[PDB]
């Protein structure tokens, strides 16, 4: 009685592929257009906000989560897989670093920690592997601003701009052409709305874009108005009005 | 308790007391003091009685099991080293053992290993172990001679026990003699200390050159 | 239960093979290339990053070069993910040898462990194995410079020139000819780059499609100092050989 | 705080004879000066010509016995009703005794019966393990008083016939069941006077190949 | 471990020819403060066993639950069971004893002392004692707590051998129990003025008179007044 | 793979049936218990100059009063022996005496039941049942000389003689005719050699046969190469003079 | 739980998984042991086709199990490490506990025992390796040669050969050895061993590795130089018997 | 305890270890030696509690000997001293430590330098040109420092060690009846039979 399932559910096929990773990727291709840009004077990430219903809050909805204070992530794939994964990433990041080295994990180090979760899950049976791909966009004061891709298997590679979801390749073409480093964060926000207007047609607004930047400070993001002791967050998610203001700014 | 073994030309002479008491009055002259491991191996009861009773019979079983397993006679050495590993684990929680593992094997000859509660393992050629050890060794030593025949050898073993029995109140009911030979051990009887004392006093002249 | 809800692919085959292992080598043969040239004053290491872009960083040149020690490093051919678990555990296996005896692990011990963990995933558990092949770039004072490759099957072999990844076949056919049995680093660098161009299709050989590391004895750097070449030092060596074409 | 361990008195006596053996015990059970029982069988038949008494502390007796009663049952099942030998039973007890010593035991156990080659046998135990075979064994609180007579008259030790008393002696005769019972009644009648741990009743179980035979002699009541 | 803070004292018993009698005060002490007066400490377990428990109340409460579960588990396997394979005095006592021995052997002990009295419905009288030390014994008279000391020598004049058991009647038996208890209240003040007393009959099953009170009052102390508050300056 | 709890319409498990298939492929083991001993004989078989043929035997001692000869897979009979030694040793320590051959077979048969996925009754740790059947022969002081056939299925029967192996169908048939209730140890051993000769396609040598015996002044005793050959020498001449 | 089945019966009374284990050994390299009455010779292939191997850190086929005992094999290296490790531990376990140098028979029982376990026990498969175990018992000058299969069975053999073209090397050896007159001198027993193993390696005289074991820890591996010399000689012998 | 001295001279590493067990007047045994060969050029001598001694000694021996066959390589005396230390420093937390103080005397065949390691039961390992444990060192350090200063041969060490042992048995009231001396150098391990003035 009870489970006995310990046989791996991810297995090799005659070609050298892994059935479960192939499947999972189809889901990711069909998922919501997300991109990431390093502006060099920041990092701007944008993703599609969506609504389920007009009578539905989209405050609760999670399309951009802060993994650690200076770092945000966005994705294309399977929403439920994303939500749990964010949780295990937040937990280990807090317990194992935030009073051990006395600060957040470096971006590359955090990409490896995610990578490991996904790989445990691919090796081991009882459970199928995560079906997701992430774009982890970040700042760490020992590497600047970074952009990574995290694949479903947990393969990762460095990027300085990319897009995943539906309609990626052409989105990368517009981004490649418009930005080539040394660019204001504001300007990268403008370029990003332009790339996505061409990418999404039928109805387009800044109330269907959810935009976050890592690329600012306020005293409010030290979390106190007194005498500094540390630097604190640089994650800031914008409200819908601010985004419409940048849509009005040519 | 004074329990002894020596290796000599003829083999090994194992000489021991037997004595159980209710007060100081010796209730019975018979207590266990020799634990029979196997037909050629002796181990002595002393120290933790219970620890000795259980673990030397146990030892006998595991030895019998080796003779099936590997089809070889055991060493006295192999026997001791097993005992010691187990003894050290149960230390600090109790467990007390005082034994000498004595045997005469074809693959070593007459061989004696000393084994205690703390896990020492020592080989020697002459032992007395006990609390009457120092006196008993005196008697043993001045008439020791490796070359010597079994008959004399036995009477000397016995005299060391009586000498010990008289000063200390932890031996002397009767004296049990065993000769461990190549082909197994041979009992040589229980000697009444009462008849034995009178003979020895006149005869040896040791602590008794001028009788006292 | 799980009997008719699972299968057994970790069993043998009517040739003596294991399904997943044979297949694992296939996965490796279309992954990016790693090359190992052992010299006798150094180790020269080259890797091709297949496909590079101006949207990927080409700036990170540890992407397939990882140091497992300051005396042993591997070059990876297969997946980043598969790689990560054996690296982290290998680095840990190091520290244990180092703590116990106050001396670094030889290459050979560390390989034999790795291989036993990899064999283990097909040997019990029902699990799947890794799909990444390692080239060990390494040191001993018993064996000089050492060059190994180990596979998901857990067989390991001693080398002084080896390749795994794609285009293995082309690199090794040129390399065996142009090899000199005892040679300096700089000579090795000339030989490597020469081989490299003609294993990379058309005009493509660039500094920023390459990862290069060399392990030299030095005399302003310490004995067995591993230099993992960052872009700019690749640019230099290409111009010196003149091979950029 | 707590240690339940004390004493509960009582006295048992085992004698190996020529073909037979006895386990005699008084039937008085105490805790200090109070009477727990004035009849409570203090020799009990465990079966197989084996009769058994754990004198000392009661609380350990009851436990020792229950562990052992289930072993008599399991030996039979697992080996098709092959009856338990006095020597084998003695080994089985050794292991029981030795099994607790982190909670140590304070009993003097004695078993009596016949061995399977037909000689009366009595075995005496030390409270945390060990047994050895003896010819005669007085046990319990009043062990120390009973043994010095017993040694003369049964065992012919520290007993010599008026002459020189040193090359002339009184010799060993294995006693009869009648002659043993006289001795045992005499021991116990003297014992009652001197010990408040002996009295009330005397149960002698005499053990023969015709079974276990019960005898009852009366003793002193306050 | 533990040492007392809460006590109950004194449960006394005897055999007669065709039953048993047991009587006990009803008490939860906090020392010498009679805190709970009325606490059950004869627990009828069926109609043929009464369990008397003396000692620590904290321990007594736990056994009190355990006995009430034994009835519920005795209705399991057949509901009309009461001499078929459940509900006999020997069963209730052996059960208690196995727990009693285990707890002391690990030294975190049940700090009670128990008297199981009943009349088997298959046999004759049952009377057996068990304490915290793991000593257990049987006798025709038994008492725990103070009553072991003081009541039990009174009991022994009526019955204390087998032979004296047919020669004691319900009336003779009841007179000894009523005498003994009067003694217990007189020389020891812990014992509550209210008691419950039960007579367990072959002839008429279980008769339990609850909440009976000491009577045939002593006021003997009045003879010995040499004053203790009667002051004249 | 294949069910571990899935029975035939009769109600005989697949795994049990498959157990019976490996047994039938070993070399014969034949026992006759007599009133002075138990004889166990095996065909060891194979003779080669690149083979040490008198270093391998199929008659292994469990105890100073218990042997077993086997037939079927030999690798399997090693796990059975490891369990059996441990159980016998622990019983000699507790009660000082011989363990019963029937008792031993039941203790072993209990661990023959595990195979497959686990139960909630039992923790099934193995993968197949054992593919060897055994003739365990012994002595006890309470039933004398005995001979037992343990099947890996669970069933164990006491016999006065039984053959197992490939060539058992013929062998058993001969055993009955030769068997009588005044048979002795010395006759039984000669007869074993007759049976073995008959069914061989070779000359009977002691590098293809091994004898063993039980006498209660020596326990389980291997009839050695030197003695077994002397017995073979005596056979060949006497047979070859009845022709 | 992964204690459930992974090795099942055949209907023929074999085991599928043991039949498939033996195939991996055959595809493999060849190892041989030939006995004198003074030595036991072990030949092991090292057929390096490619010249880009560095062969002082290319694995060997000879392990110490003990100072007077060797193990050689033919089969997957990966599996063979796992068996080799458990066998070294067992030699030291005896040494520690019995105060006695190790006897060859018990070690063989041990090597047999782990492989035997993994066929019988669930959620494990047997090793891909057959072995030869040889050495000398203590204070003993007579040779010992054992063969174990990953079935877990075991035997002694006067000589045995394994791996690829086992048939060919048995068949040859059978004509050049008798138990009644086996070789006394190292040179001629080695000559025979090199000659059998020449005939299956193809070209080899540096690709053949000989290690000759004399009583109690005199274990010496003959070199290329020496081997090239015996091959010359064999080319002289084959035109003296023409 | 057990008086165990070590002196590292120029050509070899000399360890001195007690030779007898004295019960009363007379030596019951005077054939004692307590040392174990770890490897042919790594030696460990031992002092402490007599049952903690054999139990540790065979435990450490077994592990290092498993590494020797496995790798078919001899390990350094440095390698062994780090190993011995770590293992002591796990047990000193535990509730039944060993109470064994060791000296491991080795010739590092791989540096070609002599090395002497003194290791406390605590796990305090120190490399020294001479050392002692306990109350011994008060009498013998005062000679060793004055009369001896580094860079002295094998012959010189022999005489020095004799002088030391004679003062310990007179003036210090511990009795252990002299030492029998062993030398660990390049060519392995010999026991120096003589003890008349060496």
Curated annotation (Swiss-Prot), chain A:
One of its GO terms (biological process) is proteasome-mediated ubiquitin-dependent protein catabolic process. Its main location: cytoplasm. Coiled coil: none annotated. One of its GO terms (cellular component) is proteasome complex. It comes from the Eukaryota. CDD domains: proteasome_alpha_type_2. The proteasome degrades poly-ubiquitinated proteins in the cytoplasm and in the nucleus. It is essential for the regulated turnover of proteins and for the removal of misfolded proteins. The proteasome is a multicatalytic proteinase complex that is characterized by its ability to cleave peptides with Arg, Phe, Tyr, Leu, and Glu adjacent to the leaving group at neutral or slightly basic pH. It has an ATP-dependent proteolytic activity. The 26S proteasome consists of a 20S proteasome core and two 19S regulatory subunits. The 20S proteasome core is composed of 28 subunits that are arranged in four stacked rings, resulting in a barrel-shaped structure. The two end rings are each formed by seven alpha subunits, and the two central rings are each formed by seven beta subunits. The catalytic chamber with the active sites is on the inside of the barrel. PANTHER family: PROTEASOME SUBUNIT ALPHA/BETA. This is Proteasome subunit alpha type-2. It comes from Saccharomyces cerevisiae (strain ATCC 204508 / S288c). The gene is PRE8.
UniProtKB/Swiss-Prot annotation, chain C:
GO terms for cellular component: cytosol; nucleus; proteasome complex; proteasome core complex, alpha-subunit complex; proteasome storage granule. It is found in: Cytoplasm; Nucleus. The keyword Nucleus applies. Keywords: Cytoplasm, Isopeptide bond, Nucleus, Proteasome, Ubl conjugation. SMART domains: Proteasome_A_N. There is a cross-link at residues 99, 198, 230 (Glycyl lysine isopeptide (Lys-Gly) (interchain with G-Cter in ubiquitin)). PROSITE patterns: PROTEASOME_ALPHA_1, PROTEASOME_ALPHA_2. Signal peptide: none annotated. It comes from the Eukaryota. InterPro entries: Ntn_hydrolases_N (IPR029055), Proteasome_alpha (IPR050115), Proteasome_alpha-type (IPR023332), Proteasome_asu_N (IPR000426), Proteasome_bsu_CS (IPR016050), Proteasome_sua/b (IPR001353). GO terms for biological process: proteasomal ubiquitin-independent protein catabolic process; proteasome core complex assembly; proteasome-mediated ubiquitin-dependent protein catabolic process. Its main location: cytoplasm. Present with 17100 molecules/cell in log phase SD medium. The proteasome degrades poly-ubiquitinated proteins in the cytoplasm and in the nucleus. It is essential for the regulated turnover of proteins and for the removal of misfolded proteins. The proteasome is a multicatalytic proteinase complex that is characterized by its ability to cleave peptides with Arg, Phe, Tyr, Leu, and Glu adjacent to the leaving group at neutral or slightly basic pH. It has an ATP-dependent proteolytic activity. Belongs to the peptidase T1A family. This is Proteasome subunit alpha type-3. The lineage of its organism: Eukaryota, Fungi, Dikarya, Ascomycota, Saccharomycotina.
UniProtKB/Swiss-Prot annotation, chain E:
InterPro entries: Ntn_hydrolases_N, Proteasome_beta4, Proteasome_bsu_CS, Proteasome_sua/b, Proteasome_suB-type. It is found in: Cytoplasm; Nucleus. One of its GO terms (biological process) is proteasome assembly. GO terms for cellular component: cytosol; nucleus; proteasome complex; proteasome core complex, beta-subunit complex; proteasome storage granule. Keywords: Cytoplasm, Nucleus, Proteasome. PROSITE patterns: PROTEASOME_BETA_1, PROTEASOME_BETA_2. It comes from the Eukaryota. Its main location: cytoplasm. The keyword rRNA processing does not apply. Pfam families: Proteasome (PF00227). Transmembrane segments: none annotated. Present with 16900 molecules/cell in log phase SD medium. Belongs to the peptidase T1B family. Non-catalytic component of the proteasome which degrades poly-ubiquitinated proteins in the cytoplasm and in the nucleus. It is essential for the regulated turnover of proteins and for the removal of misfolded proteins. The proteasome is a multicatalytic proteinase complex that is characterized by its ability to cleave peptides with Arg, Phe, Tyr, Leu, and Glu adjacent to the leaving group at neutral or slightly basic pH. It has an ATP-dependent proteolytic activity. PRE3 and PRE4 are necessary for the peptidyl-glutamyl-peptide-hydrolyzing activity. This is Proteasome subunit beta type-7. It comes from Saccharomyces cerevisiae (strain ATCC 204508 / S288c).
Curated annotation (Swiss-Prot), chain F:
Keywords: Cytoplasm, Nucleus, Phosphoprotein, Proteasome. The 26S proteasome consists of a 20S proteasome core and two 19S regulatory subunits. The 20S proteasome core is composed of 28 subunits that are arranged in four stacked rings, resulting in a barrel-shaped structure. The two end rings are each formed by seven alpha subunits, and the two central rings are each formed by seven beta subunits. The catalytic chamber with the active sites is on the inside of the barrel. It is found in: Cytoplasm; Nucleus. The proteasome degrades poly-ubiquitinated proteins in the cytoplasm and in the nucleus. It is essential for the regulated turnover of proteins and for the removal of misfolded proteins. The proteasome is a multicatalytic proteinase complex that is characterized by its ability to cleave peptides with Arg, Phe, Tyr, Leu, and Glu adjacent to the leaving group at neutral or slightly basic pH. It has an ATP-dependent proteolytic activity. Present with 17100 molecules/cell in log phase SD medium. One of its GO terms (cellular component) is proteasome storage granule. Belongs to the peptidase T1A family. This is Proteasome subunit alpha type-5. The modification Phosphothreonine is found at residue 47. The modification Phosphoserine is found at residues 48, 243. The lineage of its organism: Eukaryota, Fungi, Dikarya, Ascomycota, Saccharomycotina. Pfam families: Proteasome, Proteasome_A_N. SMART domains: Proteasome_A_N.
């Amino acid at each position: 009685m009870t489970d006995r399932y310990s046989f791996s559910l991810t297995t090799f096929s005659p070609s050298g592929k892994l059935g479960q990773i192939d499947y999972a990727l189809t889901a990711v291709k069909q998922g919501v257009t997300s991109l990431g840009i390093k502006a060099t004077n920041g990092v701007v990430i944008a993703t599609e906000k969506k609504s389920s219903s007009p009578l539905a809050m989209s405050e609760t909805l999670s399309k951009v989560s802060l993994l650690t204070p200076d770092i945000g992530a966005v994705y294309s794939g399977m929403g439920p897989d994303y939500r749990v994964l964010v949780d295990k990433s937040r937990k280990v990041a807090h317990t194992s670093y935030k009073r051990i080295y006395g600060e957040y994990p470096p971006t590359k180090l955090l990409v490896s920690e995610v990578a490991k979760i996904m790989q445990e899950a691919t090796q081991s049976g009882g459970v199928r592997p995560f079906g997701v791909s992430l774009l982890i966009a970040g700042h760490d004061e020992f590497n600047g601003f970074s952009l990574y891709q995290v694949d479903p298997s947990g393969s990762y590679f460095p990027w300085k701009a990319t897009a995943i979801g539906k309609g990626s390749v052409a989105a990368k073409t517009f981004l490649e052409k418009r930005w080539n480093d040394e660019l204001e964060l504001e300007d990268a926000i403008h370029i990003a709305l332009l790339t996505l207007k061409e990418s999404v047609e039928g109805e387009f607004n800044g109330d269907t874009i959810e935009l976050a930047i890592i690329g600012d400070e306020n005293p409010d993001l030290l979390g106190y108005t007194g005498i500094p002791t540390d630097k604190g967050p640089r994650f800031r998610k914008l409200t819908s009005q601010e985004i419409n203001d940048r849509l009005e700014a040519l | 308790t004074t329990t002894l073994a020596f290796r000599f030309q003829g083999g090994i002479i194992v000489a021991v007391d037997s004595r159980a008491t209710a007060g100081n009055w010796v209730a019975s002259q018979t207590v266990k003091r020799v634990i029979e491991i196997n037909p050629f191996l002796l181990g002595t009861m002393a120290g933790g009685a219970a620890d000795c009773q259980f673990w030397e019979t146990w030892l006998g079983s595991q030895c019998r099991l080796h003779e099936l397993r590997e089809k070889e006679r055991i060493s006295v050495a192999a026997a001791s080293k097993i005992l010691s590993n187990l003894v050290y684990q149960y230390k600090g929680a109790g467990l007390s053992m005082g034994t000498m593992i004595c045997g005469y094997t074809r693959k070593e000859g007459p061989t004696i290993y000393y084994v205690d509660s703390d896990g020492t393992r020592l080989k020697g050629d002459i032992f007395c172990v006990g609390s009457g050890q120092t006196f008993a060794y005196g008697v043993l030593d001045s008439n020791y001679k490796w070359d010597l025949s079994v008959e004399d050898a036995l009477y000397l073993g016995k005299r060391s026990i009586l000498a010990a029995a008289h000063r200390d109140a932890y031996s002397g009911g009767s004296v049990n003699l065993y000769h461990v030979t190549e082909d197994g051990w041979i009992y040589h009887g229980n000697h009444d200390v009462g008849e034995l004392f009178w003979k020895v006093k006149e005869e040896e002249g040791s602590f008794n050159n001028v009788i006292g | 239960g799980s009997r008719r809800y699972d299968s057994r692919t970790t069993i043998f085959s009517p040739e003596g093979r294991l399904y997943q292992v044979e297949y694992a080598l296939e996965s490796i043969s279309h992954a990016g290339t790693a090359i190992g040239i052992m010299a006798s004053d150094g180790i020269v290491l080259a890797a091709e990053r297949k496909v590079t872009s101006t949207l990927l960083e080409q700036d990170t040149s540890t992407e397939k070069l990882y140091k497992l020690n300051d005396k042993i490093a591997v070059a990876v051919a297969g997946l980043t993910a598969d790689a990560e678990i054996l690296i982290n555990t290998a680095r840990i296996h190091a520290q244990n040898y180092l703590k116990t005896y106050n001396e670094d692990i030889p290459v050979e011990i560390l390989v034999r462990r790795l291989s036993d963990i990899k064999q283990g995933y097909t040997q019990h558990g029902g699990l799947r194995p890794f799909g990444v092949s390692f080239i060990y770039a390494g040191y001993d004072d018993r064996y000089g410079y050492q060059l190994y490759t180990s596979n998901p099957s857990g067989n390991y072999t001693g080398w002084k020139a080896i390749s795994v990844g794609a285009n293995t076949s082309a690199a090794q056919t040129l390399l065996q000819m142009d090899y000199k049995d005892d040679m300096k680093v700089d000579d090795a660098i000339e030989l490597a780059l020469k081989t490299l161009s003609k294993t990379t299709d058309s005009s493509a050989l660039t500094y920023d499609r390459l990862e290069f590391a060399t392990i030299r004895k030095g005399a302003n750097d310490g004995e067995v100092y591993q230099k993992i070449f960052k872009p700019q030092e690749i640019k230099d060596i290409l111009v010196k050989t003149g091979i950029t074409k | 705080q707590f240690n339940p361990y004390g004493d509960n008195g009582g006295t048992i006596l085992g004698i190996a004879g020529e073909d037979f053996a006895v386990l005699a015990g008084d039937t008085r059970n105490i805790t200090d000066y109070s009477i727990n029982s004035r009849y409570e069988p203090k020799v009990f038949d465990c079966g197989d010509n084996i009769v058994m008494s754990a004198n000392g502390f009661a609380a350990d007796g009851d436990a020792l016995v229950k562990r052992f009663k289930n072993s008599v049952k399991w030996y039979h099942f697992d080996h098709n009703d092959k009856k338990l030998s006095i020597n084998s039973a003695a080994r089985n007890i050794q292991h029981l005794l030795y099994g607790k010593r982190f909670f140590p035991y304070y009993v003097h156990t004695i078993i009596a019966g016949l061995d399977e080659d037909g000689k009366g046998a009595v075995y005496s135990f030390d409270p945390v393990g060990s047994y050895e075979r003896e010819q005669c064994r007085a046990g319990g609180a009043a062990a120390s008083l009973i043994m010095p007579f017993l040694d003369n008259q049964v065992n012919f030790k520290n007993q010599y016939e008026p002459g020189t008393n040193g090359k002339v002696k009184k010799p060993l005769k294995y006693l009869s069941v009648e002659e043993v019972i006289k001795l045992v009644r005499d021991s116990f009648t003297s014992a009652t006077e001197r010990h408040i741990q002996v009295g009330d009743g005397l149960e002698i179980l005499i053990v023969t190949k015709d079974g276990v035979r019960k005898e009852f002699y009366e003793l002193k009541r306050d | 471990t533990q040492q007392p803070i809460v006590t109950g004292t004194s449960v006394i018993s005897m055999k007669y020819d065709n039953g048993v009698i047991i009587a006990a005060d009803n008490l939860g002490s906090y020392g010498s403060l009679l805190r709970f007066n009325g606490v059950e400490r004869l627990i009828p377990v069926g109609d043929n066993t009464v369990v008397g428990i003396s000692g620590d109340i904290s321990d007594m409460q736990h056994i009190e639950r355990l006995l009430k579960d034994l009835v519920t588990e005795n209705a399991y396997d057949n509901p009309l069971a009461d001499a078929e394979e459940a509900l006999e005095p020997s069963y209730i006592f052996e059960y208690l004893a196995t727990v009693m021995y285990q707890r002391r052997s690990k030294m975190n002990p049940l700090w009670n002392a128990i008297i199981v009295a009943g009349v088997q419905s298959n046999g004759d009288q049952f009377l057996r004692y068990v304490n915290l030390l793991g000593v257990t014994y049987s006798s025709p008279t038994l008492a725990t707590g103070f009553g072991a000391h003081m009541a039990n020598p009174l009991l022994r004049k009526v019955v204390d051998r087998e032979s004296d058991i047919p020669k004691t009647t319900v009336q003779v038996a009841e007179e000894a129990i009523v005498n003994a208890m009067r003694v217990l209240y007189y020389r020891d003040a812990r014992s509550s003025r209210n008691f419950s007393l039960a007579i367990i009959d072959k002839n008429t099953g279980l008769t339990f008179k609850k909440n009976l009170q000491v009577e045939n009052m002593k006021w003997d102390f009045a003879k010995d007044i040499k004053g203790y508050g009667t002051q004249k300056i | 793979d294949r069910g571990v709890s899935t029975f035939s319409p009769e109600g005989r498990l697949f795994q049990v049936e498959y157990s019976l298939e490996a047994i039938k492929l070993g070399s014969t083991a034949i026992g006759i218990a007599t009133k002075e001993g138990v004889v166990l004989g095996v065909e060891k078989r194979a003779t080669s100059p690149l083979l040490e043929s008198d270093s391998i035997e199929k008659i292994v001692e469990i105890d100073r009063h218990i042997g077993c000869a086997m037939s079927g897979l030999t690798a399997d009979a090693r796990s059975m022996i490891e369990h059996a030694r441990t159980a016998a040793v622990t019983h000699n320590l507790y009660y000082d005496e011989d363990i019963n051959v029937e008792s031993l077979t039941q203790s072993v048969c209990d661990l023959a039941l595990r195979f497959g996925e686990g139960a909630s009754g039992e923790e099934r740790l193995m993968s197949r049942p054992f593919g060897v059947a055994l003739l365990i022969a012994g002595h006890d002081a309470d039933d004398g000389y005995q001979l037992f056939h343990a099947e890996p299925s669970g069933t164990f029967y006491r016999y006065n003689a039984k053959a197992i192996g490939s060539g058992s169908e013929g062998a058993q048939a001969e055993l009955l005719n030769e068997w009588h209730s005044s048979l002795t140890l010395k006759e039984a051993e000669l007869l074993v050699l007759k049976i073995l000769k008959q069914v061989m396609e070779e000359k009977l040598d002691e590098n293809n046969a091994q004898l063993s015996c039980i006498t209660k002044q020596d326990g389980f005793k291997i009839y050695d190469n030197e003695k077994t050959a002397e017995l073979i020498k005596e056979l060949k001449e006497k047979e070859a003079a009845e022709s | 739980g992964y204690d459930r089945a992974l090795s099942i019966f055949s209907p023929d009374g074999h085991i599928f998984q043991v039949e498939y284990a033996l195939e991996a050994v055959k595809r493999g390299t060849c190892a041989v042991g030939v006995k004198g009455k003074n030595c036991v010779v072990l030949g092991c292939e090292r057929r390096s086709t490619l010249k880009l191997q560095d062969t002082r850190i290319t694995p060997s086929k000879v392990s110490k199990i003990d100072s007077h005992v060797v193990l050689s094999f033919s089969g997957l290296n990966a599996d063979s490490r796992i068996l080799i490790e458990k066998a070294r531990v067992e030699a030291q376990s005896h040494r520690l506990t019995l105060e006695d140098p190790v006897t060859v028979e018990y070690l063989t029982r041990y090597v047999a025992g782990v492989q035997q376990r993994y066929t019988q026990s669930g959620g494990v498969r047997p090793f891909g390796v057959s072995t030869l175990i040889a050495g000398f018992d203590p204070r003993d000058d007579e040779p010992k040669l054992y063969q174990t299969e990953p079935s877990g069975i075991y035997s002694s053999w006067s000589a045995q050969t394994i791996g690829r073209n086992s048939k060919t090397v048995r068949e040859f050896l059978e004509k050049n050895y008798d138990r009644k007159e086996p070789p006394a001198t190292v040179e001629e027993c080695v000559k025979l061993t090199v000659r059998s193993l020449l005939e299956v390696v193809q070209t080899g005289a540096k690709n053949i590795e000989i290690t000759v074991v004399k009583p109690d820890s005199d274990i010496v591996a003959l070199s290329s130089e020496e081997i090239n010399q015996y091959v010359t000689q064999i080319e002289q012998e084959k035109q003296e018997q023409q | 305890m057990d008086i165990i001295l070590g002196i590292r001279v120029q050509d070899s590493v000399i360890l001195a270890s007690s030779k007898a067990v004295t019960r009363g007047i007379s030596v019951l045994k005077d054939s004692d030696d307590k040392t174990r060969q770890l490897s042919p050029h790594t030696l460990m001598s031992f002092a402490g509690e007599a049952g903690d001694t054999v139990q540790f000694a065979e435990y450490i021996q077994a592990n290092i000997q498993l590494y020797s066959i496995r790798e078919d390589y001899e390990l350094s005396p440095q390698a062994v001293s780090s190993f011995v230390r770590q293992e002591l420093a796990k047990s000193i937390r535990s509730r039944r430590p060993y109470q064994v103080n060791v000296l491991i005397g080795g010739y590092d065949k791989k540096k070609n330098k002599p090395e002497l390691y003194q290791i406390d039961y605590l796990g305090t390992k120190v490399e020294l040109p001479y050392g002692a444990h306990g109350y011994s060192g008060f009498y013998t350090f005062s000679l060793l420092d004055h009369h001896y200063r580094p860079d002295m041969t094998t012959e010189e060490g022999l005489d020095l060690l004799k002088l030391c042992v004679q003062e310990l048995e007179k003036r210090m009231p511990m009795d252990f009846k002299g030492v029998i001396v062993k030398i660990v150098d390049k060519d392995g391990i010999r026991q120096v039979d003589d003890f008349q003035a060496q």
